[model samples]
Target: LYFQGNVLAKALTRGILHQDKNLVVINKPYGLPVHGQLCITDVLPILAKMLHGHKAEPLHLCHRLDKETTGVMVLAWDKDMAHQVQELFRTRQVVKKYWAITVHVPMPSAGVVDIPIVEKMTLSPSYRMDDGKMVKVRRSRNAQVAVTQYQVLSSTLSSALVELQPITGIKHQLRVHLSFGLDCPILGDHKYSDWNRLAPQKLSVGTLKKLGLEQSKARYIPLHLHARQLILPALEELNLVCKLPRFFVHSLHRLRLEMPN
Candidate 1:
């Protein structure tokens, strides 16, 4: 690879799933923030250069995935196309599906959680860093209606593999619904979780043994949530699915969770 020296560039190149004159689809990696990342936008110029030429305009983001979340992401080669996809998102025409590993399973195992989140400001740890450095932030609260459909594909007592589909898109909708509505917080979702017992900041001793992550410095918890699929019929019947990251699959194996085909 010509980008052997640039890890992020290499990652972007390798993650591409589909590319055409107007759109570029990718299975984006965890930590590749779409908004305001030092490397994220920096490489857009290079991508345009690589695919077209020096005359080509840089790519534009169509949607967002939380920095810690991984999977299907789309970018447009032109601003107009970007806005077109953005319109689809705003109109709720795009079908989005997510896969998550949670600390516990929902009561019904398959159901919808409808709740409204209002806007508010709060002090919390900088999500950019795991450590405690309180930062004031405007964030999700239940006010207007939001709905999420979920199904448990498989489970182990320590954790459950679940499929999530948000019927109404809201900021942090999946995180809030899974926690506040279903009473099961996603694994490694520290922000919404009640650290002591609800979400358990640290995995239990048995779970630590099961995952064997305690002794490994690199194996610590990171958000086990991913935007697995997106289908936008307006985009000429566009449908894309992303493979789970290695970290996600490995954790699933450790916990004996099954992946739904």
Candidate 2:
């Protein structure tokens, strides 16, 4: 297999946490989208080339992680294995655990967040409102049940390192639940956060210059959520864990939060 010596390519090669006959587990890097135009979909071809030692079978995505979230991801080498793995996810047989650094501490330190999520809505389409005219509108629908259980591993004055397990996976479930249910948003989560205050401290002057950014511009950090562990009972009782991303560790360090063993 051929690959250019780019950052993404390097991560793909070195990020293999584990691999077996039926599955390949990768430690997905932050900013790598699980699916999207010119995203990790483009990397699949190279991975498939390397994975297919003999015979030809395209790699299959058993599950996915959000674009900004980093951590363990499972892919299947064969169609049957892919089907089985996906079924396990669909039936909630596989267990997933995530680590999130929240900007504010959650009350009680541990509990279940049972909330319903629906597709986020935007302003309804309309042009002129004075008189009747051709107009179209769309409303939010397809509300899904979402449940997340979280435990505060460690905390400081302005931040907490949380462990999250989603009982039901919904779109942006963890983000929504943490923001709304716990009244605290994950650090560096721009979408769900109010952006009122930046946690983990502002970027240093040298760090800003390294990114070629002036002091005036906002130094946006990467999201602090990571899918760290998985237990797949359906796939021969596979258990896997991924290390925290560099930014997550740095944030934890800045917040003076203890890293969980």
Candidate 3:
């Protein structure tokens, strides 16, 4: 990894939050790429470079986050540790929870998103709801089943604060599920192009003024979804929490809604 500048490097090194013999955990900030080609300098590579002296071998990522999402992440220093944790995840022994802010209205307070997703594209495939029951979706070259259980933390006339538990981890599962179930896509869900359908028709002029955002400039989608906490039986500590960003907190605050703290 080459550093054009070292601001990010310095901060990640300083922000190290937890450590075990071959594992580490940290609160990843929003807008940081988890893994990708744009920089060859995502959080993983940067952390690997920073850990050059912290361990004898290269570090390995146990899982990932979307470039836009933010929250706690775990990584292992060796292949064995990586495999172990990955197994825990695959076995459903790992507990992962996410918090999201969406433009959709909350329905029925709490429930499950039990829709099945099929990967339509043979290459660079993305998941979507099954077209039919047993028939499945055509062009579903590879399909992965997934489930998300959610509890409504709070709600407004047009927005919802949701706690998401993804029973099966798949790419963009939660975001896609939100669109199909809640009818409100996340505020900045760039991957979802049909947002106009879920978008609010007319913002209350008074509400817009209160948020200090214009109808055009006001974020039409989710501000930023977050992986807020994790629980796993493989670790001594079973639960962990990552606070929501200031932007999300403030959005809720504007409505007189409370944050989990």
Candidate 4:
């Protein structure tokens, strides 16, 4: 397996957060599509070359993020370890925390969105995920239950910093919940912006200004969701926290949002 030390390799090298004999964790960068150029797999062999000069084993992805979503990602050195971690995620044992920028704070500062999600429109195209398993739903009202908890960390009338926790990890749970349930779509999540009809998200003039985005190109801003932390119950002290991507940090600063101390 010959892999080049290209741009993706460099980014993946800088993003490595943890590694051991069994697994590796990295902060995935935004704009790097999870499925293209065999993203991490291509980079892993390159990583092996940089390491003890050993050949790269066929790695397994234990979890994933979207092409534009950034955050903590886990991969395994072997198939069995990948299954173990997958079981943990399936059993809802791994705690996941995400940070996001939304158009505005939901009323009363905090709440939960307990909506059932159905794929009426294919904003998220069906792709084999987490090792070729398709997480699918029926066509109509027979929707799967999706629950997400969120709170406003900081806010103005225009842009807000929100913390999200998904109870059911359904496909696009947080994105749909925030958009459909509260009309507070993830800052640049335009696909599901309509509060009830599942339409494209629209930005207010104030939101654009506060986010330092020009009205003409506000729709092109990247998604603001970041997988900030992951706590695997199997580990005693591994928090698995990751840093926000540069664009997210800049937006946070521009929106005057501060993390809690």
- Residue-level lDDT tens digits of model 2 in 1-261: 134423454567688988888888888888778776446666666577765643555578888898988889988888888899989999999889999988778997999887566676112222325466655434335556778899999987667899999989787889889886787788666666663334333444644443355645533666789998999994557889998987777767766789876
Tell me how far the alpha carbon of residue 252 in candidate 4 is from the true structure, in angstroms, after superposition.
1.2
Cα lDDT tens digits for candidate 4, 60-174: 7787787778989887777899998988888888888999998867876798887667664322323326666776643445467677888888887777899899977787888
TM-score of 1: 0.83
Which pairs of residues collide in candidate 4? Answer: none
> Per-residue lDDT for 1-261 in model 1, tens only?
236325666667788988877788878778767766344566777777766778987888888887888988898998998999999998889999999998777888999887566653122221323366655444344356678899999987768999999988777888878877777888877677763433335557777787776634323478899988999875568788888999999989988898776
* TM-scores, one per candidate: 0.83, 0.80, 0.79, 0.83
RMSD of each: 7.3, 7.4, 5.0, 7.6
C-alpha local distance difference test of each model: 0.77, 0.75, 0.67, 0.75
Assess the local accuracy of residue 42 in candidate 2 as a C-alpha lDDT between 0 and 100.
67
Residue 150 deviation, candidate 4, in Å? 1.2
What are the per-residue Cα lDDT tens digits for candidate 3 across 129-176?
A: 466534333545456677888887877776677888998888788887
| Candidate numbers sorted by TM-score from highest down | 4, 1, 2, 3
Please report the candidate that would top lDDT against the real structure: 1
lDDT of 1 at 62: 88
